[PDB]
A paper describes a structure:
The AD hub, which evolved from bacterial dimeric enzymes, extends the β sheet to form lateral contact interfaces (LCs) needed for ring assembly, while the ancient dimer contact was preserved as the vertical contact interface (VC) in the mirror-symmetric two-stack hub. Here, we present near-atomic resolution cryogenic electron microscopy (cryo-EM) structures revealing that hubs from the α and β isoforms, either standalone or within an β holoenzyme, coexist as 12 and 14 subunit assemblies.
Cryo-EM maps of 12-mer (2.6 Å resolution) and 14-mer (2.6 Å resolution) were also obtained for the β-isoform. The superimposed structures of the 12-mers between α-isoform and β-isoform had a root mean square deviation (RMSD) of 0.35 Å, while that for the comparison of the 14-mers between the two isoforms is 0.3 Å. Parallel simulations on tetramers extracted from the β 12-mer (β12T) and 14-mer (β14T) hubs gave mean RMSF values (β12T = 0.11 ± 0.02, β14T = 0.11 ± 0.01) comparable to α14T (0.09 ± 0.03). In contrast, the tetramer δ angular distributions extracted from the 12-mer and 14-mer hubs have substantially broadened distributions relative to the narrow distributions of the 12-mer and 14-mer parent hubs. The δ angular distributions for the parent hubs are well-resolved from each other, whereas the tetramer distributions were superimposable with a mean δ angle intermediate between the mean values for the parent hubs. Importantly, they suggest that the 12-mer and 14-mer have comparable stability as their δ angle curvature deviates slightly higher or lower, respectively, from the most stable δ angle determined from the unconstrained tetramer sub-assemblies.
Numbering used by the authors:
A (entry chain J), B (entry chain C), C (entry chain D), D (entry chain I), E (entry chain E), F (entry chain H), ...: 408 to 542
Write the structure that this text describes.
Amino acid sequence: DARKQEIIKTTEQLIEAVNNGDFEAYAKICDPGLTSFEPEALGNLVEGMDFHRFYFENLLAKNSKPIHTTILNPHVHVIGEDAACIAYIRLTQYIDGQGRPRTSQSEETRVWHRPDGKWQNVHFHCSGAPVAPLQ
Amino acid sequence: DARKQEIIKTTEQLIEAVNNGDFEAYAKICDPGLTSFEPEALGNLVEGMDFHRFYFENLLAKNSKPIHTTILNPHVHVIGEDAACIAYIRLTQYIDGQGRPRTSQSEETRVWHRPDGKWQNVHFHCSGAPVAPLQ
Amino acid sequence: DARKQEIIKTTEQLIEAVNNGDFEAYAKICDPGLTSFEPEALGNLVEGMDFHRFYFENLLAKNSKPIHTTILNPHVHVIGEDAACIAYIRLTQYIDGQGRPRTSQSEETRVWHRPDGKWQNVHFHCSGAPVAPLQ
Amino acid sequence: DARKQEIIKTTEQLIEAVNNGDFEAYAKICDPGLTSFEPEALGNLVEGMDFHRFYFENLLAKNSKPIHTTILNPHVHVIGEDAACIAYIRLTQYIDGQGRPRTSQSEETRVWHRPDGKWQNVHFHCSGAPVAPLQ
Amino acid sequence: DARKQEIIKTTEQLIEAVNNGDFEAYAKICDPGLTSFEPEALGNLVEGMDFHRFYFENLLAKNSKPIHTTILNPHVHVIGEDAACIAYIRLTQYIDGQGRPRTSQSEETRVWHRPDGKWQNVHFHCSGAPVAPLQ
Amino acid sequence: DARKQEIIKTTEQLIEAVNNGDFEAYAKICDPGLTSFEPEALGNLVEGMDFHRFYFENLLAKNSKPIHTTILNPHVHVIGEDAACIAYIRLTQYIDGQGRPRTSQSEETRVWHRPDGKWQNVHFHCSGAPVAPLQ
Amino acid sequence: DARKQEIIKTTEQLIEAVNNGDFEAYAKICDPGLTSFEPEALGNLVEGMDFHRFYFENLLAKNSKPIHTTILNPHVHVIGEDAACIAYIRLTQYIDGQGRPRTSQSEETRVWHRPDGKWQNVHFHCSGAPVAPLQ
Amino acid sequence: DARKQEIIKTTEQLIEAVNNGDFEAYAKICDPGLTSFEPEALGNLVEGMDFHRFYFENLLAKNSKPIHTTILNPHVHVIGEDAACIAYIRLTQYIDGQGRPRTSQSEETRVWHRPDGKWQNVHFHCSGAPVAPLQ
Amino acid sequence: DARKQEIIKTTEQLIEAVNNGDFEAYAKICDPGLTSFEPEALGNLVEGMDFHRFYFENLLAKNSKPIHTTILNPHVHVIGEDAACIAYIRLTQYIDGQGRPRTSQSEETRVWHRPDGKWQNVHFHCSGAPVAPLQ
Amino acid sequence: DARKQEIIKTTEQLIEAVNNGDFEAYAKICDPGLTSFEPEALGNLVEGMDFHRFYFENLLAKNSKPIHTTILNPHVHVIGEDAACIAYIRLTQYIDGQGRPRTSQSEETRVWHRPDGKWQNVHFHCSGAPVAPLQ
Amino acid sequence: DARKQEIIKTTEQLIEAVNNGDFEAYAKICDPGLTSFEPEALGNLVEGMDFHRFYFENLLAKNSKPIHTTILNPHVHVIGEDAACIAYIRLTQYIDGQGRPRTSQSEETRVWHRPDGKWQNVHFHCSGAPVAPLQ
Amino acid sequence: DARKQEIIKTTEQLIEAVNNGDFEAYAKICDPGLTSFEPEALGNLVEGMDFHRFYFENLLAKNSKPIHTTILNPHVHVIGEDAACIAYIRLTQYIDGQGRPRTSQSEETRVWHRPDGKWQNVHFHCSGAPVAPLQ
């Protein structure tokens, strides 16, 4: 359970670096060849950092309204000593463009490798609501 | 490229065992603790074989109409010697309940481990069209 | 955990007596003053057995098609020695009126009392899909 | 009828502490392990206080417009001396974001335990309109 | 409570004479100048028996499928010794044109007079679902 | 026709006391145990004055725009000397939230008793448009 | 009232000649230069018999199912000794293409002249449901 | 053709008195017992001046924007020397609530009598767009 | 008026040759370079006979059900001695694919030239319903 | 081709006089008995100048925003020496009520005569988008 | 114009080989590395013959109903002596799944190369209606 | 691969000249007889520069908000030494009319010729989202 709690802790560091808009910390968690599927990419497989960079510069660095996030039913597969995978449900509570509280759901998969003693993310898949909020 | 072609070959064996309705071969490719996200599970994370078993018994063992499948733009991450991940776009051509040809798209992620010298699947995530066909 | 497994076992006996259409076993699990909220009652609070009796006589005793049910994330509150409450997510896999497999979800609460040494159900609440199937 | 009037009185204290935005009184009525089903949680079972805390901080502490609430057809099950359950219909009259009066309906179940001589809430289930108002 | 139970009993005789298709008994319960509002009359006030006669001749005398009816929360006003009024919610369980069980709701008011020692109906108002079933 | 004109006159006094917002005159026309069905109550049977009080305090005491009302095809049943019933179509002409004239229709039933020499209202049923105007 | 009852009687002869499919009697009631507005003419003013002839030949001579018609609130203007006008609401009860009873409403104006001692129809206007039934 | 041109001229005087908002001239053209069918009356037959008075006071006396009206294909029936009927298509060109030109269509019937040497209107029927404009 | 009646007569010969399915007579009325706009051509300008030929071969030669056509408000421009233009509204009464009478409207323009002593059609424009019927 | 270029040139003079709002030049191109079909006339045949005059006075004399027009695939029929007909597709590029560029399509027919040595327009037919722009 | 007529002729040979279902002639016109965009491929770029092969085997070899095709406004770019490009509008007239004639439109681009003395197709792009017909 | 990288480089120069609003550089890349299919042209084939000029003058020269563009899966056909064709998927990230980031997809084909030693564009085809952004 010690190695599973380590993957959980490192995944929580990713999620709070994203919602802080901290792109310089996000870039240290991600591999340069990272690939992803997500609702914003319209069914295409994205590669590298530059597609995601646009949302840090146009939302996450600029926003100020309160947000709360719940992680439900996490499951971890540990795949030897170099590799791991985590899957969870995410609920986000947020304030819309006219002051009403709202909720949305996503389903997320993250794939982790340990090159050079540090855990880094190599592939990501998301379903459900967009991460760009529906305000 | 040799190890990447091996993951491609093993992923093609999974896809043809599914569309043949060969549940006894499917059960040798999958780990007993396998987890999944897919459109049929309504946003929930499924564990084990028994949710999928229902579709082999009520479609895949019984169907006879022609189907064709195209795999587009595959990408493989090889994660040491025990682990790998593959991501691809899938297009399926099928005949509906009244003889008309149709097309649908999915986006798929599969996570592979090599316990006891044999590659086996430990997590799967699907977006887009259901695998239960829209006939 | 022994008393929690007992409530789980007794709740599984209720669910299989319903999907067998066994109204004479259902009547031994329920209290005569049982109350319920469910989608079929259109927002009203029902009392007694006679509202439910209609669905045993017009579906559950007559149906023959295959059904599978998954219970997800159960939680039990044990409230002294006489009382308990259980909450769970239910997924049902079923065949429609033209041979296609389908899925639906409900959320369920059940309240249990132990009069005369036997566990019996006194209140029930359901949300999501109707239990009368969407075939 | 004396013990039933006591559960009614305590349920009315909960409802007025919520619509006053009095989170410090709400926290004394609820057990720390409380679970719930409600429309805002999107079909998931919530545990603990922190999901509900967001609506006290972003609505109930800040609102000033007039509200009226009617409780219809309450039913109480008393389950020995430590335990009780209550079920009722709730109608709420409220003013929208442009000054028009509106109405909405919910159906609610609440499960009560008496640890250490004080009644506290251990499970809650809601159907119908959200508690976050449709202004 | 004796006179209220008499109005309840006489109202149950009306409802079962209607669902039996017994127009010759219905004609003995109704005053010749009876007026009504109901969904089938498109917002108009009907007078006399001949508008209702059409539904006995084209449904109620001819139907054979099982029907169940629940009366909820009845209230009676007794207005001296010659007059009374009753108000109730009606739920009807029925089988559709393809064998599926269904539910519908109406709200009903009935006004009763005692000319010549016999109770007879002088005005009726219905809201909600039509009495002609939605099969 | 003299007693019928008296019920008509008293019903017109009710309608103008409501559209003046005169809740202290409305309370002298109504019995303390009065019951009603209306579109604002969402299919439920309301009892007493406090549900209606909210619309006097949040509209009828505060409004200033011109309104005109037409009563069509009234019918009266006189039920001995203590009791009467009246039924009519109501058309209301009103100005919306942006200065355009509009029309709406309701169908209404009212039940009258004469305790202590004064006519008072004991039950009411409404269908069609809400009495809260669609501005 | 004698001359008004004569216009009513002659208008009832027209309506029953139409629903019998008796085009040879209809042609004796109508002036050769008769004009009309009705839903079937798509906003145009029709002149003469030949537009209406098509509905006698393709429905009214061929139909066999039961129909009932109610005339509501008739008003007559008598305009000297040669001329009259009548206006009424019409409700029609009919059976659809699969055996269910249905209702529809129209509003109708008819203009009458007495050339050569016989009343004949010179202009007609209809609003609401089409006369061609919605089976 | 002289008597037909007289009815045309008098009908044009009505139409321009209405669009000027000249209710004191309108009241001299209409009979005190005039009846009408029109889209604003929701399927009911109106009698007298007071329903129409509301639109003079809340639009026609207050408006200032340009309007143009075309009368198409008029037909006149002259019914002895005391009575006449006219039927026509009306097209209205108008400016909406945000400055765009718009068009709408009605179909109209008007019935005229000559009491005391002066032509006056006794019945009116309208179909298509409301006369209260769709701005 | 003699030359206008000649264009009317020749236009009626075209319309009855079309609804008879008489393509060999249609080909004698049309110029070889004829152009047209119509709903079936999806906004394109068609040239020559071969686009129209398909509807003679697949409907007009094969149909048997009764059809009636009304021509409304025709207008003719005569343009010297060689040339003419006609414009009219067309109403068609027809029986649908399940035996119900239906109506549809078109607006039509036709341009006529007299080469070699015989009138022939050189351009046609249609708006409204398709001539291929909505059965 | 010289006479065809003359009709093209004169048709371009009409189109630019319209979009300049130059009603005094438009009136010299049109014959006083001109007829038209267009979307703004709701399926009716218009005659003379006064229907079109309203759009010069309420838009074309007042507008200032940039517009561009493309004429596609023109075809000309020359019908002796006094008469001609032209048909074309028209695309219009325009700025909406909030500054965004938009496109729309019409199909147009125009009929030309040469009385007194000057070409003038006698009939016009339009389909597709209205000439009043959809800003 | 000789080389342009050659590209037109070769493009007509492709279109008739497709609608004959002649896959062995289609394979001689296409380059082995051919790429395409079309509505059936859901926004993806297809490569090679095997995606198209499915529609020959499941429609074009099996169909028997009459089809007609019009090519509108073709444009050819000739790019030295080895290469050419053609663009056209295509209208297809066809019979649906219940015997009614229908029309649909596509816009098509085709790119041609002359390796080894024979013209062959290297890229294709289609917009508008699918080539799999909407029967 | 050198000649393919040259076509890629020249295609990237076109795309950045367009999103800079640099119409004087765009005019040096395009042939004077260039043809195109695109969503803005409503299914028509455009020729020359003047249709596109309108979007430079009314958007691209005036806009200031941030935009990002991704080119996916490019494919090049090189057709001797004078000619080439390129096909790709384009994703655009942009800010809407109220500050929210958005995504859209197009599929694009471009045909290139080398007259006088300089590459120039002769035909273009686009599917999917309009190039005028959906803000």
